[PDB]
Every structure is written in structure tokens, then in C-alpha cells.
Design a protein around this ligand. Sequence first.
Ligand SMILES: [Mg+2]
Ligand SMILES: [Mg+2]
Ligand SMILES: [Mg+2]
Ligand SMILES: [Mg+2]
Ligand SMILES: [Mg+2]
Ligand SMILES: [Mg+2]
Ligand SMILES: [Mg+2]
Ligand SMILES: [Mg+2]
Ligand SMILES: [Mg+2]
Ligand SMILES: [Mg+2]
Ligand SMILES: [Mg+2]
Ligand SMILES: [Mg+2]
Ligand SMILES: [Mg+2]
Ligand SMILES: [Mg+2]
Ligand SMILES: [Mg+2]
Ligand SMILES: [Mg+2]
Ligand SMILES: [Mg+2]
Ligand SMILES: [Mg+2]
Ligand SMILES: [Mg+2]
Ligand SMILES: [Mg+2]
Ligand SMILES: [Mg+2]
Ligand SMILES: [Mg+2]
Ligand SMILES: [Mg+2]
Ligand SMILES: [Mg+2]
Ligand SMILES: [Mg+2]
Ligand SMILES: [Mg+2]
Ligand SMILES: [Mg+2]
Ligand SMILES: [Mg+2]
Ligand SMILES: [Mg+2]
Ligand SMILES: [Mg+2]
Ligand SMILES: [Mg+2]
Ligand SMILES: [Mg+2]
Lengths: 127, 167, 48, 106, 111, 122, 197
Amino acid sequence: ASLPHPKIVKKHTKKFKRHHSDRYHRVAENWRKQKGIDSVVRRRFRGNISQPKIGYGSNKKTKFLSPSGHKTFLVANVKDLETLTMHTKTYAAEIAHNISAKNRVVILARAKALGIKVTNPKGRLAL
Amino acid sequence: TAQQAPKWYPSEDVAAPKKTRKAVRPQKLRASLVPGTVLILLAGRFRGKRVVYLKHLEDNTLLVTGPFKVNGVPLRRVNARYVIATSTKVSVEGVNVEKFNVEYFAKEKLTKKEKKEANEIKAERVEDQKVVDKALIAEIKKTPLLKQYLSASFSLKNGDKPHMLKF
Amino acid sequence: LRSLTTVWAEHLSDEVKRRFYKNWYKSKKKAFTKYSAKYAQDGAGIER
Amino acid sequence: AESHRLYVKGKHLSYQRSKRVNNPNVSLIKIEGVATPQDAQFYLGKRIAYVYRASKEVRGSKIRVMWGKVTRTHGNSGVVRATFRNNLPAKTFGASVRIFLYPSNI
Amino acid sequence: VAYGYPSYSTIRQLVYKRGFGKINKQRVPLSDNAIIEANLGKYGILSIDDLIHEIITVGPHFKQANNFLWPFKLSNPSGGWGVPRKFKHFIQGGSFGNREEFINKLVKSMN
Amino acid sequence: FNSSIGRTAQGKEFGVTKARWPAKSVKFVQGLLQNAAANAEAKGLDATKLYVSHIQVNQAPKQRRRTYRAHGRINKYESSPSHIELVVTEKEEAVAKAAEKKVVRLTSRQRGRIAAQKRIAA
Amino acid sequence: VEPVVVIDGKGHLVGRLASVVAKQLLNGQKIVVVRAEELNISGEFFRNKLKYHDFLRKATAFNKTRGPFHFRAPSRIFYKALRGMVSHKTARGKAALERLKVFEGIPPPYDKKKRVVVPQALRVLRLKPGRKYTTLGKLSTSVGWKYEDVVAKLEAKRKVSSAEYYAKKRAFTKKVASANATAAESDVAKQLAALGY
RNA sequence: GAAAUUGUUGAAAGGGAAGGGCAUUUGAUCAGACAUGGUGUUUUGUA
RNA sequence: GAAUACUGCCAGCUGGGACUGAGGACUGCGACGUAAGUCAAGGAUGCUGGCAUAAUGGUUAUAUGCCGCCCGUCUUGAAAC
RNA sequence: CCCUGAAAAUGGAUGGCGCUCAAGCGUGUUACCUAUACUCUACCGUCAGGGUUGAUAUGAUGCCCUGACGAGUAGGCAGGCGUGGAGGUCAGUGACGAAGCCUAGACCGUAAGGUCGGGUCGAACGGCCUCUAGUGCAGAUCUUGGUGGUAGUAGCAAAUA
RNA sequence: UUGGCGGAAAGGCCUUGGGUGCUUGCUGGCGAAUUGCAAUGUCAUUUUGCGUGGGGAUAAAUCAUUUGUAUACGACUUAGA
Ligand SMILES: [Mg+2]
Ligand SMILES: [Mg+2]
Ligand SMILES: [Mg+2]
Ligand SMILES: [Mg+2]
Ligand SMILES: [Mg+2]
Ligand SMILES: [Mg+2]
Ligand SMILES: [Mg+2]
Ligand SMILES: [Mg+2]
Ligand SMILES: [Mg+2]
Ligand SMILES: [Mg+2]
Ligand SMILES: [Mg+2]
Ligand SMILES: [Mg+2]
Ligand SMILES: [Mg+2]
Ligand SMILES: [Mg+2]
Ligand SMILES: [Mg+2]
Ligand SMILES: [Mg+2]
Ligand SMILES: [Mg+2]
Ligand SMILES: [Mg+2]
Ligand SMILES: [Mg+2]
Ligand SMILES: [Mg+2]
Ligand SMILES: [Mg+2]
Ligand SMILES: [Mg+2]
Ligand SMILES: [Mg+2]
Ligand SMILES: [Mg+2]
Ligand SMILES: [Mg+2]
Ligand SMILES: [Mg+2]
Ligand SMILES: [Mg+2]
Ligand SMILES: [Mg+2]
Ligand SMILES: [Mg+2]
Ligand SMILES: [Mg+2]
Ligand SMILES: [Mg+2]
Ligand SMILES: [Mg+2]
């Protein structure tokens, strides 16, 4: 149902993990660059982790595309959803986490009427 | 609001493709494949069965008969890339293969709603095979041991080298 | 060198078979009983 | 017939490799009865199936197949390079593999 | 560098396969006689063969013709360099030097 | 927790060489076993097929005192109390069987193979 | 090409044979080697004896029980010469070594199976005439192998019994040759001769 | 009511470390695509 | 009096294998034909089959092949005893 | 070429194995293996040179065409991610559950990070344009607080019982 | 089913008689299809459990006590219906 697009290519699926995040607990996994003088990671020795850099940039025609083929958009109320009336083929709505269950019902009902795809049509559903 | 807005939206209109310049022309099939040669099936249900080649069909395929009376391979369609053309030649003049075409074989795929696990043949396919092969076997019966040769199944042994083998 | 077979005597004294038990006092003392049954025929299982 | 084999036997030797670096995307295959590249030149383009057995049931069988083709010869002894849809698990070094006769050329 | 005297065939292969002009400080493939017309029409050059003729026969406008061509980007030889070791003179069985007329064999491999 | 302790022949039952007789722990444990059994009796359990289904021990807050070392230095001297909890349960017979039906999807060529095999056989 | 391969070690070179064998193990071919006491080593006997003695001296200083073990059996000497030829510290190597069995003399059932030789590792086809060579069995006893006499005894028994097998085999094949000779000069044979059989 | 640290339960591996990088096997686990408009009324609530 | 070897040229013909299909109404350069028009001419199309489900794929654990020294710092030089 | 000349301390190193018309030495001819190198293609970014006000529809700091290039400590510059608080806006979210916390569950970005599902939770919080700073931690024998291995270990032995 | 040989890891080899299915040594008759143009198209062995109905036999070790040819504790050596 989405707009046709070329094949999705990422060139790197593995998340870039901070060096020694697996060794010391206080070293969080969020990527920081190693600024050490004799750090093998900074010197790019063979057999070590690969640093993030611009060469891994994804295709512009593919950037920000969900595997379904849409661009994710965050919606908070009914009025917000109407901004996607004419852009169903490119954008998909997604209810914010802080939306009440009752307000989620009216959001999903409106989206179905207008054919707007919803990425998470299961949040806070009582069944 | 949660996410403010995108200032520009991509166009919803789909664009037409460019004028492709890839025309279609028939194959230049290998000279070893001659109507009336004996072939070997390298794949499928009837793999390894020595068979006879009849006609080059329009959808890049070869019309093939067993004969069905000898070994049990009926009138069937194959692809030239999965068979081996032997040096044995069968004179196939005097048989009407022009009746057979790409539309002569259809599958009539069933609807996905109807799914069967318990489980037939067309009468015309039976008689078409019966007419053709009985005309052929009048010719196979000339060369000695070839009738048994078609009934046999091809198989590699120890020591054989296909790069040095002859067919 | 490897041992291939062992041939025992038909009867064993009480003291010798006590070597085969770590607790002789609470035991059925069934040492070589079925091996004794290998005897009572002339030479079938032994002379062979 | 007592023999139903329609493929030639092969042994997966190793990945493409230097002393210290190997490339799993390319595999080296030894074909029985081939000792020179000229003979191996006939075997290019053929299909290669690796047949292994698995405990869990998938889709009607215990047998799962790795499909691949040869690409070019290798060395002066008739070894050839082969690539697969998914690279061989590197545990199959020396495992027997099947090389078929299609797409045929004769 | 390894250098020698090229043949008519070798220069023909180079310009046809790897022929690039320096148009407005850009490396534009030739691929058509019109490009040569626009940039080399002043010096009587109209076709790609005109460029070849000015090259093999060193003409009055060889400097402009040669400088117009972008430097050739060649691959490693297909059959190899033919010698175990390169960086000694060709007379020593090496690679560099003035291999006077054997360069035709090399450049064809190089292209 | 058995580093640098002695050995005993009574550990052969458990295939181990290091065993002890912690009377203080044993007294507390069996105290809870009596309490649990009494609770089981109140709930109306048969008191004959019960087994210790769950039991765990985890650390409790320390109780610190002071010890006196050489050269007028002070070191910690505390206890290691425990929270002990256990659940008894009646032993049951075989639980259940008849797991999922294991639905299967067959290819068209697999379908023909079974049909041919069933046709040539009975 | 074969389930297992039985190599007759007599007249071979320990180094050249090992390289041939080692590659076969890495390729997945099961190998068993018999009569390891007739492997030959290029060089004179005293030359190789000194080499082994120099190998003896190398041991762990502080504990000789964990140093390089100096095996003395002819098969084991070959095994060490082969073990260093394979990356034995990897799981691939360990599986590779597991496919190999080195034997002294010709043991049971492998005695009833056909043995093969490696032409490129044979002494006669590799050594220039006039060069001196050694016999592994002689060397092994000079450095501590104890069982030279028993293997010589058993191989004497094995060779004797094998003689009647061939004597029966040769006599039977003579009948086959006579029958085939009579069966020739027939129509059936003529096509085989015509078709090359 | 987080982390260091610990207990129980469950899964997995373990021949003088463990941890990591590339690729894949195996196991476990996970999303989407499968209505499209349409021929069309073999139709019910007749549009 | 020829042949053949070696070297070089062909805007000579042809078989086999591998990877890539980027771009997206037309425009340009061409070629084939008297023309219509066609074409391998400024980037792939056509026919057919299976599945539509964890099948492909992602994540994670493990195994295998190969590689992989502990970080920060001073220093010409750090894994540093 | 080889041998004598040629003696040092843990056991030992043409890298190891091993290698005698060699797997050694001198020389020649090919074939073959492979680097983040060279040739070609795709994509990312940067730089440079160009086209495009015309109505309609968005972004003229927008879109598009072509070529070349991409290592890097100390250092310089630019574009961005995030935190506390301030002005403005979304008549934003929220007791039908905000914030916070856990999650080998999912999505997006090369990344800083952003979003959702699921469990606990009970009272406030966010998106965008700007303003402002006591704004981002692994190290400093850092400060305070808490917790480990060592480890049920050293040990609890002067003063007769 | 008859007997012989084989102890290096024998665990196999040879042999008697009869019965049995097949035999493409040679000549005949029928079936094959639809798995639809290929998708290993599944045919081997490794172990264990649970059921059958058919044979077969009804132990020991450790703790505890004891000994001292032993000993830090373990361990060893003893003894006890
Ligand atoms: Mg950490
Ligand atoms: Mg440095
Ligand atoms: Mg090459
Ligand atoms: Mg070189
Ligand atoms: Mg200890
Ligand atoms: Mg102590
Ligand atoms: Mg004190
Ligand atoms: Mg004091
Ligand atoms: Mg509380
Ligand atoms: Mg914790
Ligand atoms: Mg240990
Ligand atoms: Mg020539
Ligand atoms: Mg999966
Ligand atoms: Mg996959
Ligand atoms: Mg996986
Ligand atoms: Mg891991
Ligand atoms: Mg390493
Ligand atoms: Mg210094
Ligand atoms: Mg040091
Ligand atoms: Mg000297
Ligand atoms: Mg070497
Ligand atoms: Mg040489
Ligand atoms: Mg490469
Ligand atoms: Mg966690
Ligand atoms: Mg909440
Ligand atoms: Mg309150
Ligand atoms: Mg500060
Ligand atoms: Mg800190
Ligand atoms: Mg720091
Ligand atoms: Mg500190
Ligand atoms: Mg103590
Ligand atoms: Mg004291």
C-alpha cells in the first residue's frame, strides 16, 4: 500500500557499542570515541570494533523509511492526525506513549476511516 | 502536538518508467540439440531417464516424449538447460507435433480458499500420447537394443569423469 | 603383556574369598557360586 | 538401478584466505577426478548443493540444503571457487558436497 | 616509470576504451565526436581519429591535443608483469626503464 | 561457601569431600519446617505427600560491632543475618500431555511425492 | 573416493609421507597407516640417532613430567612428525587427528584389506641411488622401543598365513584366465574387441 | 526503590582465563507484506 | 622452390563462466531500411515456478574458521617488569 | 660446495614440522595465491563548476546536472545530540494514569540520541521558535555514601583447672 | 544347516546340504502422466525412553561402630548378623 521504493540497504545493522562496554559496568554502551593516544580502537587495528563514520550513511532515497515503506510520524490527538490526510502513501501515524486508552480508541477509529496506517494499533488495548 | 510538522511533503504521484530498449529475439540454441536426439533428464520427477526430443517450443522450451509406452514418461515440456544431448539420433519425420503449443499445457490453479489434502487425467492428453509414440516405436524397433536403452536409467558410477565423458 | 583368560579352582576357602568383600559380615557370601556351576560337568567350560 | 547418483562428488576445503585473513564469502571446492584447470573449465556455472541433517522439523523434512554455484578455477590442481546463497558454516571443511550437471552445456 | 614507443593499435585502444577530455577542468568521457569538436575545433581537430592522427604523427598542435586528454587510468596487467621483481631496470629483467617497443604488449595488458 | 574448610567421609553420600554440621542453621531451618507443616495442616493438606518445592536464603542487613587491632586501629566486626523462606507442596501425578498439533505446510512438489508414494503403496 | 585408506609404510619417507597424509586428513579422508617400523629416513643411522638424542635433551627444567614427551615407538615417532604438520590446537585439527590411526606391523582386520602405497613418498622413487637411509624400527629400539622382537614374530606369522591366501588366489585366477580364454574367439567377444573391451 | 553485590527458578557453554571483530550453522524470539482500485452484481441487509 | 617457428595487426567469427540492472514521460548521437518503421542507439526487460509462512530477514545465545595484549597518561618509544 | 679452525651456562628453535637427483645452494622459464593498492559499478559525505521565478503546491538557506576527492595525534573551524531553568506557541499530554524505574521486545538515525510495546507506578510532563547556564565523566593514590573477592579464611593459644 | 581356521585390537574368514525369492542368459504383454519447465525431493546410522510377549538371576557399597601394620583432615589397613 506504500509508495514503491528501491531495496532497503543499511550497510551496517549492528549497533555501534562503546569500547569496553562489555568489560566495566560503569562504561555505558552509548558510543563515545576513544581519544586515547595508544588506544587500538582509535588506531584502527585489525580485529577490533569498527567506528561509526560517514561512509555508512544510508541512501537518501531510503533514509527514514520503515520496513513497511512509510516514514514514521508521531501523533498526539485527532487534530494532529488530519495533517496526514493526503499523505497516506508516505507517512504512517503512531500514537504517543502518553495517550490515554480512551483517547487511543478515537484516534484509531479516525485513522481507519481515513486509511491512515498505524504502526502500533495495540497500545493499552483491553482484551 | 508531539511532532511539529514536515515543511515539505514528497510528491504522491508515481512516475512512469523510461522507454526500455530491450527487445526480444529467439534463442541461438546449441547445435547439439537436434529434433530426434536422445536426451537425459538431470532434474525433476523423471530425472535420469533417457528420452526423445521432438520440437522447439515458443516459450523457450522443448517438446519431449518418452515414449510413454517404453518407460512411462509422457508428453512433457522441459528446458534445454537441464538436459544433455546424446549422440544417438532418432528419425522423427512423419509425426504431427504442430498440434502441440504453449497453450496446449495449462495448469488451472485453484483458489486459495479451496485447499485439499486428500487429493484426474485429461482424455485428449492420453490419446495424443498414444498416437505419437506408437508412430515413433515403429522407428525405435529398427536399431537393436535401443528400446532397452530408452527403458534404462542414466546414472554416474565410480571412476567416470563427466569432463572427459562423451554423450 | 596382556592377560587373556583366568581359570579358577572349583572350591575356594572362606578366608580367600573374604578378599572379594569389603563387608563380609552382612553379605550373602555368593562368591564364585555360578562359577562353581561351571564345574559339575566333566570339562566343558574349564578344559576349553 | 543400484546407483541413482546424478552429481559428482566434492569436498569443501577452505575459505579464500591468506595466512592471517580469510574471506567467508568465497569457498574452495575440490572435485573428484579433476587435476587441472582445463578440465575444471568444464565445471563452471554448475549448481552445488550441500546436504545436511537437522533435528528439528521445518517444512516436511529433516534435510536442509545449501545452494551455490562455482565461479572460477583456483590454482593449477583443478580446485575451483564456489559461492552460496548463505556462506558455509566453516564447520564443513572437508565435508562432502554435491555438484550437479545443470545448467548443462552439451 | 616504464616507457617505450607505442604503436598505432595501442594508442587506438587507449582513446577508444579510456578516452577522457579536460573540459572546463572536468574529466568528461569522449563517447562522441561532438565533444572533441567543441573543444578542439580550433586546431583542425574534428573527430576522435583526428585526435589519434595528431598524436601518432606529432603535429603542430600536439601540446594542446595531448594536454586536452585526461591522464589515462590503467589497471594492473591482466597477464601480470612477466617478471618476479619489478623495481629494477628492464635490462636487469625488471619493469621500469626504456622498454623501447615491448611497451605495446604491456599497455594492452595494462588496459 | 566451602573455601579452605576440612574434609569428611560423610560427604560421599553427596559425592563431595567438603561437608560440615552447621547446627545453628539447622535448628532455624527445621523450626520453619515445623511452622510450614502446621500451616499446611490448617489449609487442609494431607501432610503425607508434601515436599519442599521452594526454598531460598538471601542476605539480611548487617549488625556491626567493633574489633580492636594493633597500633590503635579499628576494624568492622559484624554478623551476617539471613532471610529464610520456604514453600511446601503436595506431590502430584503426571501433569498433562497432548501438546500443540504442530501444523505443517507442504510444497506442491512435496504433495505430488506423497501422492505417488501412497499410490504405489497401500 | 574411499571410506578409509590403508597405506603400506614399507619403503616410504617419514617426512614426505606425513605431508601427503596430513593433507588427506585435512580433506576429510580417513587414513590408517600400517607397518610403521619400515618407514625410512634419509641420512645415515648415526646422523638421525644424534638428532633424536638432541630431541631428548629438551625437557621442562622444573618438572620433567610436563615437558615435551619423547615417544619412542616407531608409530609414535611418525605421529609426532605428523602432529606438527596439522594445526592440532584447533577443533578442526583435533577432528583431523582423530581420523588417523598409525599402526605397528599389520594388525587385525586391516590385515585382510588392500594396502596402498604413495609413489611420491617412496624411497626407491625419491632417493638417489647410493645415498644412505635408515629404518625406523632399528632407530626406535636404539632409543628405547622394547617390542621389536614381538612385531617381527607376529609379522612372520602374518606373512606366512598370507602366503596361502595368495597361493589359493593365484590358483583360482588361473582357472578364470583359462575359462576367459575359452570364452574368447566368440561372437560376443568380437564386439567387445570392436568396442574396446 | 536503580547499580554495585546476593539467593531461588529457567536456558546455555565450559581440556591452564573470560570478554571482542568478520561470516555462517543450530536453538530461541520478533515486524511487515498477502484487502489492492478494478471484470464485477454467479448477491445478501438491495443500494 | 616452398613450408613452418617467432613477433606484430585485423574497425575477423564464435563457445563457456562470474558480478552489476544504478536511472525513470520524450528530447541526443547513431545504425538498419526507398520510405513506413525498426534497432544491441544518453543505465533491463520478457516468460515461467514456488511460497505467502518465521519461508526470507532482524535480534540474541552457542559452535566453527581466521584475527584480536588493558585502558588513561608522560614519553622518541607502553601490553610493559 | 663441503669439512677443520668453532668453548657457557633453564630445554629450543631456517617460525615449526620436516626436508638429501631436496622442501638445500647458483641460474633460467612459465602457471598459480593475495592488500584498506590499481580498473569498473552502486551508495554516503565534502569540495568545485553549472541549470532552474513560470503558473499550481509547500521548502530559492529548495530541487536538479557534471567532475574530483575522502588517513591523521597536538590544534583550528562547522553542522548536530542531550540537561536544569526563562519568553512564545501547539485552546499539546495526563488519575480511563504524567514523571521515574526494568525489559538478549520493536522501529529510526553513521552517531551523539529519538520513538513505541510490555511490567511497577501515582501527579505532574512534553513537541517546536527563541533566551539563559552551577549543562554531558571512567580515570584526578578525586569527595561522600554503599557493596564485593579474599572468606566462613587469619584467627578467638600469657595469667597452672 | 555342516565343519574347519583365526588371540596383535581374535569379534572375522573359509566350508557342507537343503529350502526359499530373484535372475537383463534369451523372447513376449500391461502400468507409469498431474511432482504440471528445477527447487536434496527425504530411503544412512547414534543413543535413549516408553509399550508389548518370550527366555533368565535374585547383589553390593557407603555412613555409623571398631581396629592400628595408617593418618593433619581426607585416605589406607582391619573386624562385627
Ligand atoms: Mg558496562
Ligand atoms: Mg603514539
Ligand atoms: Mg589469472
Ligand atoms: Mg613479484
Ligand atoms: Mg584452598
Ligand atoms: Mg587453616
Ligand atoms: Mg585485637
Ligand atoms: Mg591504644
Ligand atoms: Mg518503599
Ligand atoms: Mg542487581
Ligand atoms: Mg585444572
Ligand atoms: Mg601468431
Ligand atoms: Mg529466523
Ligand atoms: Mg537467515
Ligand atoms: Mg540466528
Ligand atoms: Mg558473546
Ligand atoms: Mg592471535
Ligand atoms: Mg625515557
Ligand atoms: Mg619488561
Ligand atoms: Mg662451518
Ligand atoms: Mg616453504
Ligand atoms: Mg633453484
Ligand atoms: Mg578482493
Ligand atoms: Mg539488563
Ligand atoms: Mg507511566
Ligand atoms: Mg500524592
Ligand atoms: Mg560544573
Ligand atoms: Mg564514576
Ligand atoms: Mg578520560
Ligand atoms: Mg579511588
Ligand atoms: Mg580457623
Ligand atoms: Mg594468638
